[PDB]
Amino acid sequence: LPPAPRYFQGENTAGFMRPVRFEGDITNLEVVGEIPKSIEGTFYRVMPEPHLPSFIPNDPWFNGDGNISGFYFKDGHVDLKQRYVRTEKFVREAEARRSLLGKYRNRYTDLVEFKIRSTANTNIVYWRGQLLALKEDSPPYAMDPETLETFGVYDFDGQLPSLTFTAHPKFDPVTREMVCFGYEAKGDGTRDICYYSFGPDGKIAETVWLVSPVCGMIHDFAVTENFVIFPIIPLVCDVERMKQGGDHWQWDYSIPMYIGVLPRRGAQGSDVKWFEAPHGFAGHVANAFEDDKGHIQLQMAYAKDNVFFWWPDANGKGPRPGEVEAHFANFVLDYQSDKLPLAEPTYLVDDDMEFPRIDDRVATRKHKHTFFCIFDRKPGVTDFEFVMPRAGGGAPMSNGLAHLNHETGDIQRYLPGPRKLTGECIFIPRNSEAAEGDGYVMVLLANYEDMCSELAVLDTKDLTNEVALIKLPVRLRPGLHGNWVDKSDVDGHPAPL
Amino acid sequence: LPPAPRYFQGENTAGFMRPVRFEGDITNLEVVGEIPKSIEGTFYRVMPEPHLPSFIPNDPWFNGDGNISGFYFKDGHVDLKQRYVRTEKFVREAEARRSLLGKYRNRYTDLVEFKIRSTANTNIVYWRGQLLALKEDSPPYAMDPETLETFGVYDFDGQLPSLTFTAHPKFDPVTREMVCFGYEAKGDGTRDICYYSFGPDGKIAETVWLVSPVCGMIHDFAVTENFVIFPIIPLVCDVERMKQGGDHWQWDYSIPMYIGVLPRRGAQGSDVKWFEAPHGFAGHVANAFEDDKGHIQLQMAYAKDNVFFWWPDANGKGPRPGEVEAHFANFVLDYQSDKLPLAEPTYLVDDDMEFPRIDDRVATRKHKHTFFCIFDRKPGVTDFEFVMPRAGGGAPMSNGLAHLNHETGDIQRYLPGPRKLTGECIFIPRNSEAAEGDGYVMVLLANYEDMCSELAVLDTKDLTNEVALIKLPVRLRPGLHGNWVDKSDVDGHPAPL
Ligand SMILES: Oc1ccc(/C=C/c2cc(O)cc(O)c2)cc1
Ligand SMILES: Oc1ccc(/C=C/c2cc(O)cc(O)c2)cc1
Ligand SMILES: Oc1ccc(/C=C/c2cc(O)cc(O)c2)cc1
Numbered sequence: 001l002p003p004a005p006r007y008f009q010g011e012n013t014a015g016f017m018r019p020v021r022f023e024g025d026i027t028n029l030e031v032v033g034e035i036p037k038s039i040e041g042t043f044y045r046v047m048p049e050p051h052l053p054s055f056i057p058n059d060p061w062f063n064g065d066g067n068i069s070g071f072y073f074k075d076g077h078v079d080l081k082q083r084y085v086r087t088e089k090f091v092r093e094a095e096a097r098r099s100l101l102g103k104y105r106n107r108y109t110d111l112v113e114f115k116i117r118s119t120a121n122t123n124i125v126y127w128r129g130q131l132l133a134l135k136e137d138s139p140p141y142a143m144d145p146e147t148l149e150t151f152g153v154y155d156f157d158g159q160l161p162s163l164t165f166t167a168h169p170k171f172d173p174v175t176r177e178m179v180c181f182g183y184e185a186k187g188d189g190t191r192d193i194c195y196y197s198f199g200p201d202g203k204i205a206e207t208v209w210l211v212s213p214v215c216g217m218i219h220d221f222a223v224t225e226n227f228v229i230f231p232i233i234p235l236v237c238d239v240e241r242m243k244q245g246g247d248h249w250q251w252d253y254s255i256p257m258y259i260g261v262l263p264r265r266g267a268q269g270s271d272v273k274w275f276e277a278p279h280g281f282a283g284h285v286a287n288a289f290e291d292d293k294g295h296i297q298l299q300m301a302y303a304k305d306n307v308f309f310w311w312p313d314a315n316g317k318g319p320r321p322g323e324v325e326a327h328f329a330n331f332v333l334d335y336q337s338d339k340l341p342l343a344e345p346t347y348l349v350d351d352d353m354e355f356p357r358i359d360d361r362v363a364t365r366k367h368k369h370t371f372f373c374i375f376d377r378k379p380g381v382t383d384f385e386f387v388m389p390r391a392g393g394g395a396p397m398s399n400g401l402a403h404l405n406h407e408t409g410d411i412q413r414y415l416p417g418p419r420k421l422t423g424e425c426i427f428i429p430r431n432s433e434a435a436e437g438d439g440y441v442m443v444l445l446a447n448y449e450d451m452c453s454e455l456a457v458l459d460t461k462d463l464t465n466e467v468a469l470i471k472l473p474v475r476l477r478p479g480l481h482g483n484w485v486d487k488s489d490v491d492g493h494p495a496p497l
Numbered sequence: 498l499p500p501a502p503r504y505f506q507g508e509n510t511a512g513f514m515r516p517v518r519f520e521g522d523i524t525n526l527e528v529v530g531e532i533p534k535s536i537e538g539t540f541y542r543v544m545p546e547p548h549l550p551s552f553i554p555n556d557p558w559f560n561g562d563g564n565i566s567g568f569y570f571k572d573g574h575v576d577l578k579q580r581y582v583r584t585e586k587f588v589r590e591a592e593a594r595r596s597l598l599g600k601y602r603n604r605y606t607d608l609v610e611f612k613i614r615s616t617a618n619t620n621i622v623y624w625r626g627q628l629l630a631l632k633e634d635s636p637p638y639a640m641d642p643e644t645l646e647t648f649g650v651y652d653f654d655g656q657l658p659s660l661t662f663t664a665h666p667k668f669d670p671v672t673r674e675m676v677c678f679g680y681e682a683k684g685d686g687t688r689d690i691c692y693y694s695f696g697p698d699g700k701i702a703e704t705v706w707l708v709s710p711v712c713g714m715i716h717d718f719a720v721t722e723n724f725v726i727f728p729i730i731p732l733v734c735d736v737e738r739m740k741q742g743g744d745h746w747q748w749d750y751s752i753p754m755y756i757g758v759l760p761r762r763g764a765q766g767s768d769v770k771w772f773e774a775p776h777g778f779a780g781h782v783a784n785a786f787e788d789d790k791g792h793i794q795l796q797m798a799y800a801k802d803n804v805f806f807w808w809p810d811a812n813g814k815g816p817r818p819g820e821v822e823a824h825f826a827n828f829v830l831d832y833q834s835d836k837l838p839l840a841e842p843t844y845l846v847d848d849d850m851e852f853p854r855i856d857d858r859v860a861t862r863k864h865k866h867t868f869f870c871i872f873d874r875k876p877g878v879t880d881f882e883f884v885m886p887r888a889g890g891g892a893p894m895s896n897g898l899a900h901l902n903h904e905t906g907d908i909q910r911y912l913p914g915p916r917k918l919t920g921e922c923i924f925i926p927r928n929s930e931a932a933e934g935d936g937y938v939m940v941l942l943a944n945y946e947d948m949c950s951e952l953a954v955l956d957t958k959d960l961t962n963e964v965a966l967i968k969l970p971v972r973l974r975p976g977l978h979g980n981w982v983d984k985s986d987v988d989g990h991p992a993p994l
């Protein structure tokens with residue numbers, strides 16, 4: 001077999017990116033300041049964290065085993081519990097004591113035949129009493145919210161219609177539906193998208209099969225009262241290339257950024273309209289809603305070139321690390337229109353941004369607050385000379401959070417400091433009467449001075465100030481998505497505004 | 498109540514001394530070099546590691562909750578499992594989410610009444626299929642060697658005759674007895690010593706009650722074929738001082754270093770002879786044996802002043818940090834003699850040393866190899882300017898290991914490097930045919946550059962070279978004692994030479 005290295009090597013596992021690979025508990029975390037005593041619930045986040053050194057050199061960050069962190073808050077105290085998802089990959093590699101799964105989303109490079117290739121490393125959501133650990137090439141893995149035990153692959157009591165389940169399902173705060181999809185839904189390189197939903201009782205509601213114009217990556221989507229919307233990143237899959245050992249994804253400079261719009265209820269697959277936005281990268285969706293004319297306002301991070309530069313075009317062409325910025329865009333779509341080409345979007349702020357969150361009590365409806373990561377190159381915001389040699393590679397950098405009030409246009413910015421970077425934030429309503437966007441924001445920090453992680457708690461009344469800074473004595477490697485599950489919410493999700 | 502601090506403060510919890518407080522697993526540790534594939538067994542070590550910040554300022558290192566590390570070796574792979582002993586203190590403080598136990602060995606400063614005040618933080622030994630987590634003011638806590646679950650306080654099937662069980666029992670490799678004692682055996686300030694032993698079947702064998710001339714600290718002891726030997730450190734306890742909030746221990750410059758000798762089998766308490774060595778600190782025993790004349794050769798670390806300088810005499814007199822050296826001493830004792838004063842010992846090497854280990858297959862008999870920690874002040878051995886500001890305080894420093902061959906007088910020295918310090922080592926016989934002192938040495942390193950811990954594996958054929966260096970991504974705080982449990986030893990202890 002290709003040799004099994006016995007320590008980590010390469011930039012993707014160097015410095016702050018070096019895997020720790022711990023599972024267990026650290027209770028009664030150290031706190032500077034004071035955690036508001038009324039906060040009660042759990043912040044769950046997932047990170048890619050290779051459990052064994054890869055036989056693939058420079059294996060991308062996206063291919064690392066999912067490790068789940070839970071931060072359990074009560075009466076101003078906080079405990080950490082941490083555990084790897086027991087994927088098929090995790091278990092078989094643990095039994096063998098060596099890596100067996102090969103290249104990202106390329107089964108032809110695996111050393112054994114896997115049934116499920118999930119790393120379950122991209123999002124961790126709450127649904128009907130379980131956590132669901134998500135990875136867009138796979139069904140979810142179900143887990144226990146209290147112990148982080150893995151129950152196994154989850155197929156929704158045999159109802160799951162698709163091979164694949166998106167990392168970005170949406171929770172309708174009014175209907176309590178979980179609205180879902182999968183792309184490549186019939187296997188590697190397929191153009192099949194399966195759109196499907198579940199009612200709060202767990203029964204499947206929608207199931208619609210549609211066809212994408214290209215086999216492109218649909219990482220995120222959007223949901224409004226009457227529509228679902230599929231923005232396609234111009235990374236394209238050819239299974240014949242994969243059979244020869246090639247990459248699953250390859251950029252295509254010749255295509256638009258497709259944005260499909262389908263009626264949310266009762267549609268057939270031929271009802272989808274593939275609108276054509278100017279060529280660019282479809283980043284995360286903040287939220288979408290229908291305005292008073294019935295037009296879709298789609299607000300999302302949007303870049304003009306390939307953010308995932310390690311998967312360049314057919315001729316190896318694309319940008320370098322740190323070159324491509326993404327911006328907070330508003331696209332207007334009208335399902336009634338037969339005009340496919342769309343105008344350049346308008347931009348809500350100027351910051352290089354990503355990982356937008358809203359108050360999910362207005363998800364799918366008009367929102368007026370967004371919280372997001374920023375990367376500010378302004379001199380002195382990040383001490384790059386100190387940070388970069390300690391940082392490793394392979395993951396995006398964020399050196400602050402911003403809060404946009406969409407009514408007033410005011411922006412507040414949280415800067416953790418010159419030798420700290422942030423992950424994706426979560427928003428927590430102050431209480432069940434709180435107005436939209438009023439409450440607390442939490443965000444994990446990488447402290448490059450200590451080479452430790454910290455968890456910051458902010459009040460939305462003044463985002464610039466830490467009310468509490470929770471000081472971890474270990475590193476939590478840069479991660480992907482996370483969510484708050486409030487103790488006062490019976491189904492784990494907040495009540496509609 | 499005295500307020501409960503929410504983060505650690507003070508020199509004893511700063512830098513490398515900052516508690517981590519993690520429990521759980523890190524499997525398949527990163528390895529540089531190659532761990533000999535024939536090594537099979539587990540290295541257990543215990544560290545004091547406060548689970549909650551103390552309400553006592555500058556609480557000594559010796560008062561921290563015991564956390565057990567196991568390093569499980571097979572076929573050149575190694576896994577870490579780590580878990581706190583569930584002492585009464587640990588559990589009640591965990592329930593309250595605050596510290597409740599007060600000063601070291603002073604129950605009058607506790608916030609609640611404890612039955613058992615053990616931190617179980619000093620040694621971790623194997624006996625009859627369990628681990629015993631030891632602390633000299635208490636009975637042992639029994640634990641599972643595989644899972645590190647705590648079973649509870651252990652009383653040897655109701656046979657334990659003493660309130661206290663030493664951290665340094667000796668395992669007779671010929672009789673397979675565990676030879677034990679406790680001082681302050683009837684409670685705080687008592688001069689009662691209970692000497693007791695267990696056969697390999699678990700049945701109590703010896704039980705002798707004796708009386709110490711002062712209530713002095715007896716941290717370690719020695720066992721020969723026909724004698725047991727009790728060296729008393731000139732720290733003395735007065736319970737009236739404790740009732741006023743004072744220290745359990747206070748140095749007494751006016752007394753000798755007492756060395757009691759008792760016949761090993763069949764004695765009464767009045768058979769003890771209290772010999773009087775020149776005033777000094779009784780450090781760890783390497784081993785003791787009877788020579789051809791029937792005289793006891795007692796080989797032990799010995800200093801001329803108070804190593805535990807934070808507990809000075811009644812007038813605050815005592816040395817400063819880093820001042821006192823201990824040396825490898827040989828005391829000759831003759832139980833037949835009626836002369837109580839003893840001569841100055843001879844010294845086996847020049848090094849400032851401690852934490853001596855032998856090949857325990859000759860424990861209680863003549864040994865000719867000792868492995869020990871050294872602290873070399875020679876310029877450049879340790880880069881103090883880099884290390885000291887990162888080190889914190891409260892624990893002893895060792896910047897090498899030494900191996901003394903007692904027949905030839907040859908010494909080899911292992912120096913991990915200018916920015917690394919060591920803990921106490923373990924010795925592992927090469928196999929069951931190996932000659933005395935032939936095999937492997939393991940030692941945990943603090944790497945002040947990375948602020949990580951490492952586990953070094955050395956071959957006794959060349960102590961200067963690391964065969965393997967196991968690279969932990971977390972800190973294990975400086976600890977106390979540890980032991981090897983070989984997989985080929987059914988009862989956990991090696992076969993006699
Ligand atoms: O398997 C995976 C597939 C896709 C992803 C996407 C990640 C991602 C990361 C960003 O910084 C911006 C973004 O818009 C998306 C993660 C894992
Ligand atoms: O503490 C400090 C940390 C970083 C800096 C950076 C300065 C700088 C100056 C430029 O003209 C361009 C730039 O991209 C950066 C200054 C002070
Ligand atoms: O969503 C993402 C956005 C940006 C990146 C950057 C990756 C990267 C990889 C390297 O080898 C070096 C580097 O400096 C950066 C990764 C994911």
Ligand SMILES: Oc1ccc(/C=C/c2cc(O)cc(O)c2)cc1
Nearest residue numbers: 611612613614636660683684685
């Ligand atoms: O039948 C019994 C008679 C007496 C005892 C005493 C137990 C005891 C335990 C301690 O930790 C401290 C102590 O001072 C006393 C137990 C049983």
Ligand SMILES: Oc1ccc(/C=C/c2cc(O)cc(O)c2)cc1
Nearest residue numbers: 559619633716779780781851893
């Ligand atoms: O509760 C406790 C009581 C005593 C001890 C002794 C520790 C010790 C440490 C040294 O550096 C040298 C030594 O000879 C002994 C530890 C814990």
Ligand SMILES: Oc1ccc(/C=C/c2cc(O)cc(O)c2)cc1
Nearest residue numbers: 880881882883884885886887889
């Ligand atoms: O908080 C602290 C900050 C700095 C230090 C430095 C200690 C030190 C000790 C030495 O023997 C030599 C040296 O060059 C430095 C200690 C504590």
Ligand SMILES: Oc1ccc(/C=C/c2cc(O)cc(O)c2)cc1
Nearest residue numbers: 508509804818890891892893894
């Ligand atoms: O066995 C031992 C030998 C030495 C020591 C040193 C402790 C110490 C405590 C401090 O607060 C500051 C310091 O610089 C050193 C502790 C135990």
Ligand SMILES: [Co+2]
Nearest residue numbers: 167219284481
């Ligand atoms: Co995402």
Ligand SMILES: [Co+2]
Nearest residue numbers: 664716781978
């Ligand atoms: Co000891």
